Design a protein around this ligand. Structure first.
Ligand SMILES: Nc1nc2c(ncn2[C@@H]2O[C@H](COP(=O)(O)OP(=O)(O)OP(=O)(O)O)[C@@H](O)[C@H]2O)c(=O)[nH]1
Ligand SMILES: Nc1nc2c(ncn2[C@@H]2O[C@H](COP(=O)(O)OP(=O)(O)OP(=O)(O)O)[C@@H](O)[C@H]2O)c(=O)[nH]1
Ligand SMILES: Nc1nc2c(ncn2[C@@H]2O[C@H](COP(=O)(O)OP(=O)(O)O)[C@@H](O)[C@H]2O)c(=O)[nH]1
Ligand SMILES: Nc1nc2c(ncn2[C@@H]2O[C@H](COP(=O)(O)OP(=O)(O)O)[C@@H](O)[C@H]2O)c(=O)[nH]1
Ligand SMILES: [Mg+2]
Ligand SMILES: [Mg+2]
Ligand SMILES: [Mg+2]
Lengths: 37, 428, 426, 426, 428
């Protein structure tokens, strides 16, 4: 079987990549014009 | 993209790297067989189905330590030819390990560097480990630094070598070997850090209360340094410090790159519970002349640059508070031509403790890597050792009979002598 | 109509501006999926100054992310309001800027600047005319300073008539991360005078200081600082996007705040600021907005402005308010505070009313002043630069990628020329 | 009333046109059994251009499948959309043409050309008036370059009035395969200059260039880059296949793009194209298709249009659009970018508008232009040809099967003067 | 219709032909008796109830290694006339095999090659395997090529020899067998590939880790070259390279048709699943100047054309990057009249595991057959040995007794001498 083609009929490619990320463990606070909870 | 190939050469380099990869596999979640049940990209490869072979090159001339890894618990962790080993050792001789038997193993050394760097895309630095107070550590430590410099340019070559101790050196030719090392780690090592054993001995005795530590009980603190220093290379942090950061904020002149290291809090389980671990006190316990991993107090010199790597749940406000209380405290000096001199890289990921080790589960830690003019003392205590021994030509017939020409002792001593005369030149 | 391209470079530029695109989304009604969640045309009628229609109805922000490291700009995508940014406005590049001006401006910034001029050209030329550019970057580091300086010289010769408004953060003397920050600052300043129409100095000492003495925080963090900058960032632009009694575009800020072309270094303060102790316990009418913006522990620089004069000064107000109360309170400022204002020009205060208050407040104010006290920022960085350059500190890096020793001497001489120009009017 | 007969030769030719018949099928509702599903008058009123009836209601393509091996024409038949073509129109040949131009042209291809010419005379001459022929081949192998040009020579003498549009695939030599690429390329060019009305130059490296820096694919396969070629093949003959506001024809392209008969080698491109996570970020208007139809990378040939001049250019817009924008944007590119546009022809642009956009999309456009920068393709094959030629390279195959030495020098002459004729108008 | 006839002459040709005819037989799936439990048409006929019979002609003059074929497991798969034998051997004597005891078995061989070629709907080529350095492989084999060229012309005669290795040869009179068999290998041969035994020993002892390889393990890697070379003959792929494609892109001038082999995804268990074997990794190891299968180091030679035959799950764009990174490497140099010097083929069928063998599961492979001026040294090495032995006419009384004059020796050294002369004039 030939390799599958990754491009739709509307010439937009089908299946996406994932970026090789960087440990998305962060912390979140608030001071959003109100100063911390 | 970001990635560090680590070359361990010499028997000290092997067991240091054995603690390093025990921590690296545990922290990142790789089993001893190489299976998880991008952070693996900075130190491991990616094989067929969930496998991660370490990007490490174990190199030695004696076979008795390399094959013990092959017959040890991490046999299938490593692809079984990055652990190259010769048939005969270097006999505590720079001439043997650099000129005669290192030549027939350096070709296999660089061939494995080629295959380990062809699959890599954007190598950040060669992190070298050796003991300069030994035979193959000094000898092949020179021979790899010449060969990697002539082939791989640009890219940084760090060297976390172990200098001979002032008092407990466990050798008698220990000043010949690391006088001849000075030709290697001066003009061919990018950044060199001193980590001698009698200092981690005192740290374990004073902080961890281990009266009789072994080499393993030192190497696990050494692995904590490698984990903290490459931490921003693999885990997300508030301020990022990579190898290019680590050289541009911290190395003033091309020929001054010799360094010291300091870690805090190295605190055991029975003590960490009865104490606060805060950002302020781990800094003043870091700028203290007993947590230095070299017997070199900074009060006998002047600082030039500092590279605090805070790592844990540290808020960046208290980091600046710690820097502020260090800008006070006239005991700690700083050179006049550097009004600044604090590169603070903050990570988020807390330290990984080895089960059955000797550190408690801490939430925050700091790794000093500092440059000072006091580090000229680290060579200056050795100047007596080489003159007293080269005077009536002791232990010379091994070196000149091996193939190293006579006279090389003199300009290796003169290169070392110009190293101190550079350090009090920059410290005035 | 008018448009603004938001250039942002470096870890500081990307993180501060991501907070700006958070606030401008909450203020325009942009949901974090690209849609409009509010119901009022007084928000959406000028979304065509910071956004572009994208067929489905999605308002893509008109920003150019740029960083010479795939680091924190990948972390921008991870967080909330991080998928609004268009992915081919992301200028990647593996390389890795060591904190170094000539890596950003001579060696590694050069192979990466050809892509970001392409992205700026595809956006700016797609419309008829735009009001100008807006750049957020850091002087201390390498990728934000060295590359951001080269872009603002490239787009200056490309469009030599649109504004160059630079929300730049200057290195701090006490809070000192990065060792080579005074070098990268001084090499950035001497081109920033000749290729930027407006520069707005945001020192991180005062961003900390606002948090724990007026906002009464316990753990001031970086996200707190980026919101304080961003409230100022909308507080200079809202007369464009939103209607008002007395409108003021950014070129009206340019001509009324720059007596002489070389001097354009400003100080900002956004002060309807309070804490939880007094958020109920505080009047928020006009006269104390002017009391708080003309207050020393309020400006976003460690540049205590009682030690200098106030050559020009604008205060772009917001909220439901009267035109007499703004005029008579700032006349009250010019009257009682007389020694700290300049004397050879009259009415050194600019009025403008932006009739829509920010979200959660009934009125606000943003003060942008051209105080000559900014010369003590250039006196401290010059002090650190001369302390290093006498004994040739950290220069083997900078000469390695081909930036000469002489480039530092015009960097210091030009920066001394800015000190002297700010001195002769004082 | 007008018919295009598609002849595909070579492994490249058969695989590209298999995607071409796949995309023409779903542009026309044709199921891969010949049945037609979906109800639309416009999708069958002009289907006689590419399909014929079969007194069973089966729409059968005008395909004249050719390769000197029972290889890829077995995979075309066995794959999807492979039952459409007639089994009679599958001329095989079993001897093999091993990447040798003289094999397909002289000594093995001359005994099967008498059967594929019989097939194309049975299928194309049996109507009132055929519009022309469409030939798909690569000038890199032995079948497409050798047998393809042999049929091109025989068709132009039997029908010296009809338009032969040839979607040739030139050997892109930066990264490629087979060592005899310059021999097969140059030995075909000195025939395509005389007996070929239109030659659209396609290079594989530019197809990878779109697939890497425009579509952001993971693994660009041969199927994906054959899909992009079939986009341009369908888009050129759009007006010939559907009604529109400003209809065109292949002869309208020929008369508006060929200033002199030898200069007919076009740069082709096609782009309402976008990445995977950006079609919901990117709008769709006539200026946006325009800016991605001139720029640098939308060209399917590896020739930079900036390194030269446009002698003449054309734009085949598709879909519902305003006729003011399709005229004003061609003016806007004409007067803004004037250096890359010749002056001894004023107003070098043709626009033409289809009303039916392609499937899924709202508007598309294809470029065909006669840029003089095509000299850098013939030069990039000549400098490889003369390198091999000076020391009498892989040649005893070519000379051993009936070619004298004068044919190779005549190959160098008619392709060196082609570059020189492009010099006179740059 | 695609059909290659293998002609295995000599003891070594029978043994390498054994390991070849199982990548042909039961890689297509046919059982030992000859039943599948039409890709087989490349190597097999079909005789009714699923009996596919090998298209081979086995030639030997000693009836002892071909008798092992008649008595082994696979005696009912070969037809009992395809295993042609003799009564007495040739005994490293080129004149016996070509003039005396060759002209009673050659008439049977040409009958079986006739019956196996009129059963052909288009014969791609004669893949004849021999051992230069013996008696019936250098003798009878030379006469077989002369008879096959006169009758069966214009269709290819790809020959893979077993040219005598430089040091290891396990004979003494092999220079006379090699130099005087050069005439057939230079005129009556369309493609010649030098394939000695030391280089297979080196591949087995370095990559494959079998430190004690036997001839059976040497026949392994030779067979994997053959299956990858005819891979596109029988199986689909992105690009196909049949035997006409092969000779037309690798033979610049008609006299020069000598090439080198390398099939280097050579992995084995412990060195198999640890290493990520990508397209870049296998291509670099194929061009590596130690995996050449001739002891024919090309670092002192000029590459002319290459025939990288990727086989497996190889993506064409990965082929494109692998070719590019070979071109940018400086020690891999190419002659100046060849800007395009690669013929990339891609098969879809993956390489096959070996149970009880030496290799393992690999998803991709490379088999590049390359012509170079470096191959001029495999003939100049044996020029030294022939010149020394023919100086005082050692072993000549044998060769002259059964029917050749001593002038055959001088004209074959002349044919060798005009041979290397044509390489340095092509290279310069
Ligand atoms: N940190 C650490 N240092 C060690 C270790 N083992 C030895 N050393 C130090 O290394 C010095 C001598 O060098 P070695 O590593 O033992 O010997 P070598 O470098 O392998 O060279 P050879 O003499 O040829 O074996 C001793 O003085 C020790 O202080 C170890 O396991 N960990
Ligand atoms: N690849 C391979 N080579 C072999 C094998 N057996 C012998 N050789 C090589 O063959 C050379 C000797 O030539 P032979 O093949 O024995 O000679 P021959 O073809 O049998 O002809 P005679 O000498 O008349 O028996 C030696 O140098 C070996 O290197 C084998 O089983 N496999
Ligand atoms: N306001 C603000 N300041 C920051 C942020 N991140 C770092 N900084 C400050 O900026 C300096 C580091 O600059 P950096 O971002 O590394 O510059 P770059 O290397 O060019 O990207 C440090 O002194 C920090 O105190 C941020 O997100 N916001
Ligand atoms: N676009 C495209 N190019 C191809 C394909 N197959 C082969 N090629 C290219 O065509 C060249 C080989 O010529 P080819 O047409 O396959 O040989 P032929 O069958 O004898 O005409 C190579 O350089 C390939 O890159 C395909 O399916 N699509
Ligand atoms: Mg040792
Ligand atoms: Mg106005
Ligand atoms: Mg024999």
């Amino acid at each position: 079987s030939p390799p599958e083609s990754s491009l739709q009929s509307n010439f937009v490619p089908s299946h996406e990549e994932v970026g090789r990320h960087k440990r998305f463990l962060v912390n979140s606070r608030d001071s959003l014009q109100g100063n911390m909870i | 993209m970001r990635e560090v190939i680590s070359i361990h050469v010499g028997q000290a380099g092997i067991q240091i790297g054995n603690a390093c990869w025990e921590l690296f596999c545990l922290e990142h979640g790789i089993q001893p067989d190489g299976q998880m049940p991008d952070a693996f990209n900075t130190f491991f490869s990616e094989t067929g189905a969930g496998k991660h072979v370490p990007r490490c090159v174990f190199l030695d001339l004696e076979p008795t330590v390399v094959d013990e890894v092959r017959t040890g618990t991490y046999r299938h962790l490593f692809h079984p030819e990055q652990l190259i080993s010769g048939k005969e050792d270097a006999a505590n001789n720079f001439a043997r390990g650099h000129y005669t038997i290192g030549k027939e193993i350096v070709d296999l050394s660089l061939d494995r560097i080629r295959k380990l760097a062809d699959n890599c895309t954007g190598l950040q630095g060669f992190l070298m480990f050796n003991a300069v107070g030994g035979g193959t550590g000094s000898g092949l430590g020179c021979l790899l630094l010449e060969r990697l410099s002539v082939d791989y340019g640009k890219k940084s070559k760090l060297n976390f070598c172990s200098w001979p101790s002032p008092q407990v050196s466990t050798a008698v030719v220990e000043p010949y070997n690391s006088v001849l090392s000075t030709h290697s780690l001066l003009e061919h090592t990018d950044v060199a850090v001193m980590l001698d054993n009698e200092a981690i001995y005192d740290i374990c005795r004073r902080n961890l209360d281990i009266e009789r530590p072994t080499y393993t009980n030192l190497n696990r603190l050494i692995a904590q340094v490698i984990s903290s220093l490459t931490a921003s290379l693999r885990f997300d942090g508030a301020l990022n410090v990579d190898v290019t950061e680590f050289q541009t904020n911290l190395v003033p002149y091309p020929r001054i790159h010799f360094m010291l290291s300091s870690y805090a809090p190295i605190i055991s389980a029975e003590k960490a519970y009865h104490e606060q671990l805060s950002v302020a006190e781990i800094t003043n316990s870091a700028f203290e002349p007993a947590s230095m991993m070299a017997k070199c107090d900074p009060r006998h010199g002047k600082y030039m640059a500092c590279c605090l790597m805070y790592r844990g749940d540290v808020v960046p406000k208290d980091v600046n508070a710690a820097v502020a209380t260090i800008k006070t405290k006239r005991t700690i000096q700083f050179v006049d031509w550097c009004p600044t001199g604090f590169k603070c890289g903050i990570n988020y990921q807390p330290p990984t403790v080895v089960p059955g080790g000797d550190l408690a589960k801490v939430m925050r830690a700091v790794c000093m890597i500092s440059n000072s003019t006091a580090i000229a003392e680290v060579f200056s205590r050795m100047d007596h050792k080489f003159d007293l021994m080269y005077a009536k030509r002791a232990f010379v017939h091994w070196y000149v009979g091996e193939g190293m020409e006579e006279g090389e002792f003199s300009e290796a001593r003169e290169d070392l002598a110009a190293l101190e005369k550079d350090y009090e030149e920059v410290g005035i | 109509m008018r448009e603004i391209v938001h250039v942002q470079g470096g870890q500081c530029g990307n993180q501060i501006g991501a907070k700006f695109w958070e606030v401008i989304s909450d203020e325009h009604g942009i949901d974090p999926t690209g849609t409009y969640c509010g119901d009022s045309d007084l928000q959406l009628e000028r979304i065509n100054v910071f956004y572009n229609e994208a067929t489905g109805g999605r308002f893509v922000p008109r920003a150019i992310l740029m960083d010479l490291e795939p680091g924190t700009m990948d972390s921008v995508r991870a967080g909330p309001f991080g998928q609004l940014f268009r992915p081919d406005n992301f200028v990647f590049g593996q390389t890795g800027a060591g904190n170094n001006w000539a890596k950003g401006h001579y060696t590694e910034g050069a192979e990466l600047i050809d892509s970001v001029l392409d992205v700026v050209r595809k956006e700016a030329e797609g419309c008829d005319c735009l009001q100008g550019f807006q750049i957020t970057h850091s002087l201390g580091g390498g990728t934000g300073s060295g590359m951001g300086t080269l872009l603002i010289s490239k787009v200056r010769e490309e469009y030599p008539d649109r504004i160059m408004e630079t929300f730049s953060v200057f290195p701090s003397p006490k809070v000192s991360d990065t060792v080579v920050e005074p070098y990268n600052a001084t090499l950035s300043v001497h081109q920033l005078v000749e290729n930027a129409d407006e520069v707005q100095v945001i020192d991180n000492e005062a961003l900390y200081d606002i948090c724990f003495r007026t906002l009464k925080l316990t753990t001031p963090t970086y996200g707190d600082l980026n919101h304080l900058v961003s409230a100022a960032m909308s507080g200079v632009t809202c007369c464009l996007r939103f209607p008002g009694q007395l409108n003021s575009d950014l070129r009206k800020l340019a001509v009324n705040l720059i007596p002489f072309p070389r001097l354009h270094f400003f100080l900002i303060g956004f002060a309807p600021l309070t804490s939880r102790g007094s958020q109920q316990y505080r009047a928020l009418s006009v006269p104390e907005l002017t009391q708080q913006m003309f207050d020393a522990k309020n400006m976003m620089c460690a540049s205590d402005p009682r030690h200098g004069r106030y050559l020009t000064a604008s205060a772009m107000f917001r909220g439901r308010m009267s035109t007499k109360e703004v005029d008579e309170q700032m006349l009250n400022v010019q009257n009682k505070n007389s020694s700290y204002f300049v004397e050879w020009i009259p009415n050194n205060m600019k009025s403008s009313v932006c009739d829509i208050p920010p979200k959660g407040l009934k009125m606000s104010v943003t003060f942008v002043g051209n105080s000559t006290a900014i010369q003590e920022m250039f006196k401290r960085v010059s002090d650190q630069f001369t302390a290093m350059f006498r004994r040739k500190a950290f220069l083997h890096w900078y000469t390695g990628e081909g930036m000469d020793e002489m480039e530092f001497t015009e960097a210091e001489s030009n920066m001394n020329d800015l000190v002297s120009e700010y001195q002769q009017y004082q």
